[PDB]
A and B are shown apart, each in its own frame.
Chain A
Amino acid sequence: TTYADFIASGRTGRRNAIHD
């Protein structure tokens, strides 16, 4: 599922801005 793909991305936590 799309939700499963989201979990698989590893980007479910707080996301940093580019400069970091």
Chain B
Amino acid sequence: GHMGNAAAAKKGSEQESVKEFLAKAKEEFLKKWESPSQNTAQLDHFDRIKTLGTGSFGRVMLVKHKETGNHYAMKILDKQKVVKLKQIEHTLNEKRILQAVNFPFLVKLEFSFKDNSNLYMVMEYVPGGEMFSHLRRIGRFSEPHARFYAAQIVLTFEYLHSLDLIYRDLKPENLLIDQQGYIQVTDFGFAKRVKGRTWTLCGTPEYLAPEIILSKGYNKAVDWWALGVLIYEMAAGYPPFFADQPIQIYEKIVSGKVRFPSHFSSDLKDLLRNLLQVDLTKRFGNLKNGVNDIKNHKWFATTDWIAIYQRKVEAPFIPKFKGPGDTSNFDDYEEEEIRVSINEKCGKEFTEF
């Protein structure tokens, strides 16, 4: 067979140890999920420095904690806008997930609080910026570079899926690089606890699995499809399915045809054909062998999964870092003061936050 006796015994023991780790992590998650934390700080505990990102949600600012001097990223949400945008459940869900999970590649929520006008989530500051920016600048990542990031996503999804969480929002825009060159996942608004199937149309066109586009009930296998898109885009510099308009992207996604750059290795093409598999009965991550079909694929043969988890692998790329509070890996945004109304807005809706 492919493995001699020593290699087969080592792989078997390793897979059993994963099961043991995940069973304990689920126990710890469910304790925190059932008893969340709240009201662990207030606004005048921090100096606000610079906007790091903006969206329909609100904005994220670099802040400095007065007592400790530590820097953090503070997400500020306007309650009235969250309601108008129909995002109450997503916002409460994001906070509940973030306070309950624990994994080296998931961003840590350090504080949360609210006032008359806004909701606040204070997360560790990840100074390296978005993977998106580095990828467009460099052009593409080498296969070893892409593989180092991919391994972290595989382990992160193995963790989340064991908790029955589907992620649904994978793309380079949503992945940050930390000071040691490792990945941080931050956004959980679209994540959902689902043991079986769910039906919401959500995600980003280039990264949508066919069964979402086709308005089917779907499961955690959509995350393994999206991993295939991410690996492709990291290694090529562009995604596998693109066009001028989303409907044309969707036609390509559901077609079952994908084409590769000539510089892709055969091992990479084989993995990607098995992740970008339209037939759910054949997609890696969705078979009897589960995540092991991915982790044991030839393209990952040089990956030491425990060493990645322990953060003992030397990263291929370390972002520029001039000191704490350095914001040079993020964009510049028009600053806008944060007003707090004399009148509480939307109290009932956000009573659990």
Contact = CB atoms under 8 A, between A and B. Distances in A.
Interface string B254-296: 0000010100000000000000000000000000000000000
A19 to B, nearest CB: 6
Interface residues of B, number: 21
Interface residues of A, number: 16
A2 B201 contact: no
Contacts of A9: 242-244
A9 to B, nearest CB: 5
Contacts of B261: 2
B238 A3 contact: yes
A6 to B, nearest CB: 4
A10 B244 contact: yes
Point out which of B190, B203, B205, B242 has the most chain A C-beta atoms below 10 A from its C-beta. B242
B206 A18 contact: no
Interface string B184-223: 0000001000000000011111100000000000000000
A5 B261 CA distance: 13
B238 A17 contact: no
B203 A17 contact: yes
A6 B238 contact: yes
Contacts, number: 40
B171 A15 contact: yes
B238 A2 contact: yes
A15 B173 contact: yes
Given A3-B238, A6-B242, A9-B242, A18 B202 contact: yes
Interface in B122-141: 132, 136
A15 B241 CA distance: 13
Nearest to B239: A6
Nearest to A20: B56
Given A9-B244, A10-B244, A15 B202 contact: no
Which 9 A-B pairs give the minimum distances between C-beta atoms? A6-B238, A9-B242, A17-B204, A15-B204, A14-B173, A20-B56, A9-B244, A6-B242, A11-B242
Interface of A: 2-3, 5-6, 8-12, 14-20
Interface of B: 55-56, 132, 136, 169, 171, 173, 190, 201-206, 237-238, 242-244, 259, 261
15 contacts: A2-B259, A8-B244, A9-B244, A10-B244, A11-B242, A11-B243, A12-B136, A15-B206, A16-B204, A17-B169, A17-B190, A18-B202, A18-B203, A18-B205, A20-B56
